[PDB]
Write a protein that holds these residues in place. Structure first.
Motif, mmCIF file in Angstrom:
data_model
loop_
_atom_site.group_PDB
_atom_site.id
_atom_site.type_symbol
_atom_site.label_atom_id
_atom_site.label_comp_id
_atom_site.label_asym_id
_atom_site.label_seq_id
_atom_site.Cartn_x
_atom_site.Cartn_y
_atom_site.Cartn_z
ATOM 1 N N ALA A 444 3.384 1.061 -2.905
ATOM 2 C CA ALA A 444 2.158 0.318 -3.154
ATOM 3 C C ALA A 444 0.959 1.098 -2.638
ATOM 4 O O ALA A 444 0.968 1.580 -1.501
ATOM 5 C CB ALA A 444 2.212 -1.059 -2.489
ATOM 6 N N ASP A 445 -0.065 1.216 -3.476
ATOM 7 C CA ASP A 445 -1.350 1.761 -3.077
ATOM 8 C C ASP A 445 -2.449 0.827 -3.567
ATOM 9 O O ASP A 445 -2.279 0.090 -4.540
ATOM 10 C CB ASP A 445 -1.552 3.193 -3.601
ATOM 11 N N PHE A 446 -3.580 0.860 -2.871
ATOM 12 C CA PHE A 446 -4.615 -0.159 -3.038
ATOM 13 C C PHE A 446 -5.658 0.305 -4.053
ATOM 14 O O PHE A 446 -6.813 0.588 -3.734
ATOM 15 C CB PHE A 446 -5.239 -0.489 -1.687
ATOM 16 N N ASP A 447 -5.217 0.374 -5.310
ATOM 17 C CA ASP A 447 -6.102 0.651 -6.434
ATOM 18 C C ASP A 447 -6.191 -0.518 -7.407
ATOM 19 O O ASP A 447 -6.767 -0.366 -8.490
ATOM 20 C CB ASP A 447 -5.663 1.926 -7.166
ATOM 21 N N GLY A 448 -5.635 -1.673 -7.055
ATOM 22 C CA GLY A 448 -5.622 -2.814 -7.946
ATOM 23 C C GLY A 448 -4.253 -3.451 -8.046
ATOM 24 O O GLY A 448 -4.015 -4.306 -8.904
ATOM 25 N N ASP A 449 -3.343 -3.037 -7.168
ATOM 26 C CA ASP A 449 -1.986 -3.560 -7.181
ATOM 27 C C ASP A 449 -1.968 -5.034 -6.796
ATOM 28 O O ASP A 449 -2.818 -5.517 -6.044
ATOM 29 C CB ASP A 449 -1.098 -2.764 -6.226
ATOM 30 N N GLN A 450 -0.979 -5.751 -7.321
ATOM 31 C CA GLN A 450 -0.793 -7.163 -7.039
ATOM 32 C C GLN A 450 0.609 -7.396 -6.497
ATOM 33 O O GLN A 450 1.560 -6.702 -6.868
ATOM 34 C CB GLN A 450 -1.010 -8.017 -8.292
HETATM 35 MG MG LIG Z 1 -1.868 1.716 -7.665
#
Ligand SMILES: [Mg+2]
Ligand SMILES: [Zn+2]
Ligand SMILES: [Zn+2]
Lengths: 1202, 468
Positions: A444-450
């Motif tokens: 998980a990376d914080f680019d728009g992940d849910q």
């Molecule tokens: Mg991402």
């Protein structure tokens, strides 16, 4: 409640017993009153009332008249849910053949009546007669007669015989079959037949006939005379907004069937020509087959929307079918979903949850607590209180989630770390806050992940989340055993910057009392983080035996290293911190802390590490800029030289000295060399600087460049990325695979022009598309792997076996590929490990090899050992703890009830996306193949011996000259036959030539008994062996890839296991993926579960039957106990797909794929599923026989035995 | 070679040549010949003519329908009355000379032949035609069943020799009793069942007064006539199958598949041949096209919709559509409901009612979204479910009602409970609640009023207040 499920043919009596009435009309509802019509598809008299405890009249309407029949309607006064259970039936005017038992190859009707399928279709399609009763006539049963031929033999005999057409003729033929006499005839022909193909035909037919005899089914039940009708609520006709109605295609199919049946009855009443009756019967058959399976028999019927109608078979099968969309996977309540942010203040067991989301999720708990503490008199008061969002509601919510774990999930869930349990902390906001250290587990990376969130309800679920699913428990990778919570990016950068070393920094040479004084000096601006000082360090060592020894001493270090030592837990050496700390160093620190201190200390250390890394990365002020991409001055001159000599070689080509292909190859070579040299020059320029020390002398120091620090620390970036940023992009490929002659000579700092960018896009698009397709391929592979090994559960502790696998370090040349410690860590020995050259027992039997014993083995220089393995385990079902060994994700011996097969499949499938003679040592030479061994006795060189400076036993010194990734894995696990397989030696005998028959060649071999075997070799084959040579079994005759089936057949189980393991580990190791081999061994065991019975003995087993192995083992044990003739078998190797479809349970096989074939086979055979595996219990809602539920299922077989 | 039933159907119907005018007249003549033979065979029955005579007696009295009696007159109640009076007079004459002058006498034979000639000049309705057919068919079938039972019981040559005249006569029984072959013991034992069978036969024979030979001859003649007529009609329809498909082509894509339309047209054509007439001089195609059209249209109106619309409403919808298309062409825009109502001579409300009920229900597998995985069916709620909060509220209400009623006197709480039906299957009115101890109704009313009066006390009514 229930213990097993059967499947079988449905008799007309059984279908009538199911039905609550007969549907006689295609009516559905009235167009004005919208009420069900009598004797229709939605009749209330047959299927039940529409309203609860009411009838269509309105005379009996309350619960007082429960169970009564309205004498003027017939509607039973009961609940309406009975419309989801009550079935109907249609009495067909003419018999109709079942589509599944006719067109699902092999046709059961076809080979029961020993006549071809096309003949049966010709009879069914009303084109040819069949003689059923021959009587005193020369005709034979099953002989086809044309219409004119039929009238000829009618007028020449009369009523002596009977010939019919259609499914009625098939039913008459099948009903008159005497199955025992047929079986006896097949056995007698089987013994007295000399053709093996005919033997296969007869054994198939005999298997089907004996299945019919034993199951109690009758053949004539394959022809339908009564057609069941589904409950109306499963085929709804419900209104939408605006008066529109929504219906199911089953309504249209049933209406067609009913209309054609009624028209057939009308045509049989009003005497009609035989052509019209025949056409009507054809339509009836077509309609019934379309209802059962649309599109199988021919053109699929389409609705008013010009799309094919979807039938019962389509509603039970497929990706969108009931098995996969509603049984193995479901939508659940008490669930939520939100975007994920980063919480750097959180602990490893904590997750940030929005207040509104938790208020919605935990609503019943809030209601319960408001009722308990008296703030709400009733439940509606609590509802309004929660809706109005009072403060005490927030306090109740705080106390509800105080110790209630919550499950966080991110799609896709490649492995079990994709769902983890956390303790929620309420935050004002709308996004879930996630701990950074678990991101690598979630990918998980914080680019728009849910992420999705689930709330366990019962106490058992909460304790499972707290004990098994908690993030603190799962910090080791189950695939390899390495830690998974290792820091990355800013933590690594901060720990690297704090631990770097600088020449002539402020406060250099100072003496410090300890880490506290180092921190005090740093905070007072006396000394820098990189100042070289001497610090008094007190250091405690915990040995293997547990001895705690503390030593205080003066160590040369830096300020930052001491301030980092301030947080290191007691029990570790200072040498782990007295160095610059990249990603590998921090991983080593965490591994050592886990190995010598435990779990709680590891969690605290990881939290402190990530806090400190973030803090000092923020304090560092590391920034990326345009001046940090230094371009070496040698790049321009080197490009000029390459271009000039390209001109020279082009001029030489114009002179005709060399051809075009050679020129292409050498231009490519020079451009590759130029790229490598430019990259080297850029790295040398970027990696160092000159400083002035205290003495004034210029000194050589490692560079503090931002990009260099990022790449060297391992936080992000590599040498290639820096090469494209500051050097040369290099040679790119035309999108068919060819490499363009001219390369890109500009990096991203200077920029590219149009064509350079176009060539870059050529490869960029290919990379994106390759990733897109490879993701789906890996998903399908992991699904297949999960289903093949889903049954493997640790069922015992010790299986009481003596077998094992011999393991040695892997050698693929003059250097080792993996040490023996890595392979032997976590396994259980089978025989005692004797010290080489001695009879002493260094390691006893049934001992787990941990790091201590691994170091012992490494010290005593053991080359080969042997340990227990899963494939050699002899447990009847599943495996035992000792044969599996250590649980990688836990560190101890595997517990009973662990689903090792699912873990293995996930471990193999997760890295699917990442996928695509001179002696060099001093020692002696041994021949077997060539081996070079050092003086210690470890074989460290393995070399081929094509058909030499030193003979056997001769010492050799150093330098002496004695003289496509994921498809490959899928092919290996599917046991695919190579296109041009290598021909192997069937038996040990002398080779000889034979008669060269036209087309292809033949060879002969003479065994030790004098028997001669003939082998059929194609013309275009390089033949290696020579006449008069005794070749051993398994020797190569023609070179090429080796088929796994052949090596299993001729060499053994260990050979094929080693082959598969080595190939899979090779492809996974080329990409640098660490996977333990016990997972592959479990998959291979699931690949070896069937056996062809060769010597039948007397246990009821036909020769050439593909029985399953453990049944034979148990039967042989009982036979040995009886001292009466045992059985002999040959083990087959089946691919994961074929092994999955060959499992005993038909529910799992039906849910996997090919539902129609599996259901037909099981129904004809009359199979019985006892629900022993995970998937069937998942489908039927029961506890899985693994983990927490395992003991429960054990109690069941404690009850069934008694 | 093919799997589509349509192509096989066309192959099968293409094997017979097409007929001409003379072939049509020839087949119609064969049908009429068969019908005439059947009528003549039935007319040789003592019970047939009295039925026709009494039907005419009821009809002439202006009490029964004339069409139900006869359908036409064969020519090689202005006229029917005279013909039926002649028939009655000849029936009286025949009954006078049926047996007095002798059955074998020439008078009876001549009278029967001329009665046959007179009855040949009649066209009866098929209803009573089949009604008279069925009675003699049942008599023949019962005779066959009794004969086969006798054959099964006795089992030969003696029966075959005496079957012509002594099949049911007591002389056969007497000769069987006189026979002394070794197998006649069991035959004599079965003679009781044979006696019962022949006794049952006596009633049939006295009802018919034709013994055995006459009924056999009549049955054989009727069977021959019906078989010949059936063959002629089957040939005629086999010829016209191509006309069926040609007409049925024009109404495809109306909810019914092509083969179903073909079969319905075939049924309509069989109905057409069942009432075709060749004396009119018109060809068969003109008459058969109407029947095929009507069969196809009725089948479409009755079987092409999931929710069946009656035929008259289908006609209303079709006429509305036709007028709508005419108006759309005439003014250039969709005609509004008021304008269509004015054109169609019906109120606006009826026009709207026709408009809304002319819809065809949608499928639950209609792709809803760019990705075809989603469907409409998975976005349909279940409105009949009870919300869990409502069920919890019901349970809490039951508990609160029990708590409130537990603070009340036994008799009084019982009165409330078994007046309102709490914890029991049914509800009771005041009468049976009184019949417990005190039969008077007014005391039950007053005690219930006291129940409510104490039940609205703030000390014991706060808990139940929150449920409103
Ligand atoms: Mg991402
Ligand atoms: Zn009713
Ligand atoms: Zn074992």
């Amino acid at each position: 409640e229930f213990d097993a499920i059967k499947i079988g043919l449905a008799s007309p009596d059984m279908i009538r017993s199911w039905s609550f009435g007969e549907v006689k009309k295609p009516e559905t509802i009235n167009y004005r009153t919208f009420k069900p019509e009598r004797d229709g598809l939605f009749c209330a008299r047959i299927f039940g009332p529409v309203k609860d405890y009411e009838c269509l009249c309105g005379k009996y309407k309350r619960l007082k008249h429960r169970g009564v029949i309205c004498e003027k309607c017939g509607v039973e006064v009961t609940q309406t849910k009975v419309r989801r259970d009550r079935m109907g039936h249609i009495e067909l005017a003419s018999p109709v053949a079942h589509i599944w038992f006719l067109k699902s190859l092999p046709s059961r009707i076809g080979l029961l009546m020993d006549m071809p399928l096309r003949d049966i279709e010709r009879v069914l399609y009303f084109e040819m007669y069949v003689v059923t009763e021959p009587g005193m006539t020369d005709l034979e049963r099953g002989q086809m007669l044309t219409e004119e031929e039929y009238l000829d033999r009618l007028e020449e005999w009369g009523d002596e015989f009977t010939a019919k057409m259609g499914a009625e003729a098939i039913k008459d033929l099948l009903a008159s079959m005497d199955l025992p006499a047929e079986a006896e005839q097949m056995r007698e022909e089987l013994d007295t037949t000399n053709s093996e193909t005919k033997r296969k035909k007869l054994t198939k037919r005999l298997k089907l006939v004996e299945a019919f005899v034993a199951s109690g089914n009758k053949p004539e039940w394959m022809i339908l005379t009564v057609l069941p009708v589904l409950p109306p609520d499963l085929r709804p006709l419900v209104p939408l907004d605006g008066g529109r109605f929504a219906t199911s295609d089953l309504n249209d199919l049933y209406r067609r069937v009913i209309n054609r049946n009624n028209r057939l009855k009308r045509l049989l009443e009003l005497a009609a020509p035989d052509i019209i009756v025949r056409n009507e019967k054809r339509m009836l058959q077509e309609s019934v087959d379309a209802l059962l399976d649309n599109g199988r028999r021919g053109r699929a019927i389409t609705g008013s929307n010009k799309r094919p109608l979807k039938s019962l078979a389509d509603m039970i099968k497929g990706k969108q079918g009931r098995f996969r969309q509603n049984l193995l996977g479901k939508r659940v309540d008490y669930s939520g979903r939100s975007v994920i942010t980063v919480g750097p203040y959180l602990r490893l067991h904590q997750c940030g949850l929005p207040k509104k989301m938790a208020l919605e999720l935990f609503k019943p708990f809030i209601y319960s607590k408001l009722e308990t503490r008296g703030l709400a008199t009733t439940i509606k008061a609590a509802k309004k209180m929660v809706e109005r969002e009072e403060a005490v509601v927030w306090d109740i919510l705080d106390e509800v989630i105080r110790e209630h774990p919550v499950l966080l999930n991110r799609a896709p869930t490649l492995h079990r770390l994709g769902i983890q349990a956390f303790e929620p902390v309420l935050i004002e906001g709308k996004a879930i806050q996630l701990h950074p250290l678990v991101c690598a587990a979630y990918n998980a990376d914080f680019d728009g992940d849910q992420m999705a969130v689930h709330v366990p309800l019962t106490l058992e679920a909460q304790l499972e989340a707290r004990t098994l699913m908690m993030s603190t428990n799962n910090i080791l990778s189950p695939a390899s055993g390495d830690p998974i919570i290792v820091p990355s990016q800013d933590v690594v950068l901060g720990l690297y910057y704090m631990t770097r070393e600088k020449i002539n920094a402020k406060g250099e040479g100072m003496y410090l009392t300890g880490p506290a004084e180092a921190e005090k000096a740093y905070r007072t601006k006396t000394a820098e983080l990189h100042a070289r000082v001497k610090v008094r360090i007190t250091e405690t060592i915990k040995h293997e035996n547990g001895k705690l020894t503390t030593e205080t001493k003066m160590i040369d270090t830096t300020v930052g290293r001491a301030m980092l030592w301030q947080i290191v837990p007691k029990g570790l050496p200072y040498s782990l911190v007295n160095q610059k700390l990249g990603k590998k160093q921090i991983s080593n620190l965490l591994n050592e802390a886990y190995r010598k201190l435990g779990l709680k200390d590891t969690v605290i250390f990881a939290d402190q590490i990530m806090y400190t890394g973030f803090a000092y990365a923020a304090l560092s002020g590391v920034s990326v800029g345009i001046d940090d991409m230094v371009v070496p001055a040698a790049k321009y001159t080197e490009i000029a030289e390459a271009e000039e000599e390209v001109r020279e070689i082009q001029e030489q080509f114009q002179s005709g000295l060399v051809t075009a292909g050679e020129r292409y190859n050498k231009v490519i070579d020079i451009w590759a060399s130029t790229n490598d040299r430019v990259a080297k020059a850029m790295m040398e320029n970027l990696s160092s600087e000159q400083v002035i020390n205290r003495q004034g002398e210029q000194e050589k120091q490692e560079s503090f460049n931002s990009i260099y620090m990022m790449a060297d620390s391992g936080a992000r970036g590599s040498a290639a990325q820096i090469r494209q940023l500051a050097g040369m992009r290099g040679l790119m490929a035309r999108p068919d695979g060819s490499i363009i002659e001219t390369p890109i000579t500009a990096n991203f700092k200077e920029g590219l022009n149009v064509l350079q960018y176009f060539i870059s896009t050529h490869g960029a698009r290919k990379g994106l598309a390759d990733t897109a397709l490879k993701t789906a391929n890996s998903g399908y592979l992991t699904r297949r792997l999960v289903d093949v090994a889903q049954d493997v559960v640790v069922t015992e502790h010790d299986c009481g076996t003596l077998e094992g696998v011999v393991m040695t370090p892997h050698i693929e040349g003059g250097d080792v590929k993996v040490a023996l410690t890595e392979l032997a860590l976590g396994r259980v020995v089978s025989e005692d490990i004797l010290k080489p050259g001695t009879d002493e027992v260094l390691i006893p039997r049934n001992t787990l090899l941990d790091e201590k014993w691994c170091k012992v083995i490494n010290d005593n220089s053991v080359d080969q050992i042997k340990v227990r393995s899963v494939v050699t385990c002899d447990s009847d079902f599943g495996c035992c703890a000792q044969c599996y060994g250590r649980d990688l994700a836990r560190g101890h011996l595997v517990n009973q009830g662990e689903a090792v097969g699912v873990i293995a499949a996930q471990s193999i499938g997760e890295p699917g996306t990442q996928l695509t003679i001179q002696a060099k040592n001093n020692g002696s030479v041994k021949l077997h193949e060539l081996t070079i061994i050092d003086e210690f006795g470890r074989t460290k060189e393995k070399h081929k011996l094509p058909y030499l400076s030193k003979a056997d036993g001769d010492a050799v010194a150093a330098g002496e000259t004695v003289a496509g990734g994921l498809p490959r894995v899928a092919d290996l696990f599917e046991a695919r036959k190579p296109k041009e397989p290598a021909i192997l030696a069937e038996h040990s005998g002398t080779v000889s030539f034979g008669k060269e028959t036209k087309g292809k060649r033949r060879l002969i071999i003479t065994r030790d008994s004098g028997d001669t075997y003939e082998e059929m070799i194609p013309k275009h084959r390089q033949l290696n062996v020579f006449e008069g040579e005794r070749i051993e079994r398994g020797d190569v005759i023609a070179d090429g890839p080796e088929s796994p089936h052949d090596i299993l057949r001729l060499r053994g189980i260990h050979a094929v296991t080693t082959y598969i393991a080595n190939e899979v580990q090779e492809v996974y190791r080329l990409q640098g993926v660490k996977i333990n081999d016990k997972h592959i061994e479990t998959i291979v065991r699931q690949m070896l579960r069937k056996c062809t019975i060769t010597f039948a003995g007397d246990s009821e087993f036909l020769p050439g039957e593909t029985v399953e192995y453990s049944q034979v083992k148990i039967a042989n044990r009982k036979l040995v106990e009886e001292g009466k003739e045992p059985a002999r078998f040959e083990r087959e190797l089946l691919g994961i797909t074929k092994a999955s479809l060959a499992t005993e349970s038909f529910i799992s096989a039906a849910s996997f794929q090919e539902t129609t074939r599996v259901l037909t086979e099981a129904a004809v055979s009359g199979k019985r599923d006892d629900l022993r595996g995970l998937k069937e219990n998942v489908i039927v809602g029961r506890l899985i026989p693994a983990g927490t539920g395992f003991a429960y299922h054990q109690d069941r077989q404690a009850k069934r035995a008694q | 070679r093919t799997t589509d039933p349509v192509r096989m159907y066309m192959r099968e119907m293409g094997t017979v040549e097409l007929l001409t005018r003379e072939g049509e007249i020839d087949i119609a003549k064969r049908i009429e010949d068969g019908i005439n033979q059947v009528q003549s065979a039935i007319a040789e029955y003592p019970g047939t003519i009295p039925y026709i005579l009494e039907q005419f007696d009821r009809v002439q009295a202006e009490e029964l329908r004339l069409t139900d009696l006869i359908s036409g007159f064969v020519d090689p109640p202005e006229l029917a009355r005279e013909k039926f009076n002649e028939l009655r007079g000849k029936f009286q004459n025949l009954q006078l000379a049926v047996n007095e002058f002798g059955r074998d006498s020439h008078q009876a034979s001549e009278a029967s032949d001329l009665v046959l000639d007179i009855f040949r000049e009649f066209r009866l309705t098929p209803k009573q035609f089949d009604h008279l057919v069925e009675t003699l068919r049942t008599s023949m079938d019962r005779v066959r069943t009794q004969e086969r039972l006798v054959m099964k019981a006795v089992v030969k040559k003696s029966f075959i020799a005496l079957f012509t005249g002594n099949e049911s006569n007591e002389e056969w029984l007497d000769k069987v009793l006189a026979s002394d072959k070794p197998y006649v013991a069991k035959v004599r034992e079965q003679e009781e069942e044979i006696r019962r069978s022949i006794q049952k036969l006596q009633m049939i024979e006295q009802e018919t007064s034709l013994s055995v030979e006459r009924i056999k001859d009549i049955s054989h003649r009727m069977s021959i006539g019906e078989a010949k007529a059936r063959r002629a009609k089957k040939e005629m329809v086999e010829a016209n199958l191509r006309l069926v498909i040609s007409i049925a082509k024009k109404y495809t894509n109306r909810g019914l598949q092509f083969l179903d339309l073909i079969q319905e047209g075939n049924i309509g054509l069989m109905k057409a041949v069942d009432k075709f007439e060749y004396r009119r001089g018109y060809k068969f195609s003109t008459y058969a096209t109407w029947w095929i059209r009507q069969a196809i249209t009725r089948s479409i109106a009755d079987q092409a919709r999931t929710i069946r619309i009656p035929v008259h409403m289908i006609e209303t919808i079709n006429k509305l559509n036709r007028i709508s298309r005419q108006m759309l062409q005439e003014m250039g825009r969709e005609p509004l409901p008021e304008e269509l109502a004015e054109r169609m001579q019906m109120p606006e409300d009826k026009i709207r009612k026709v408009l809304k009920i002319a819809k065809e229900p949608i499928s639950m597998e209609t792709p809803i979204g760019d990705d075809e995985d989603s469907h409409l069916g998975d976005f349909i709620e279940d409105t009949t479910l009870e919300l869990p909060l409502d069920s919890a509220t019901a349970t809490s209400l039951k508990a609160a009602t029990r708590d409130v009623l537990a603070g009340l006197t036994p008799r009084e709480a019982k009165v409330l409970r078994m007046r309102f039906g709490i914890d029991m299957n049914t509800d009771h009115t005041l009468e049976e609640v009184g019949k417990q101890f005190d039969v008077t109704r007014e005391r039950i009313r007053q005690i219930e009023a006291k129940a409510l009066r104490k039940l609205r006390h703030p000390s014991r009514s706060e808990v139940l207040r929150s449920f409103l």
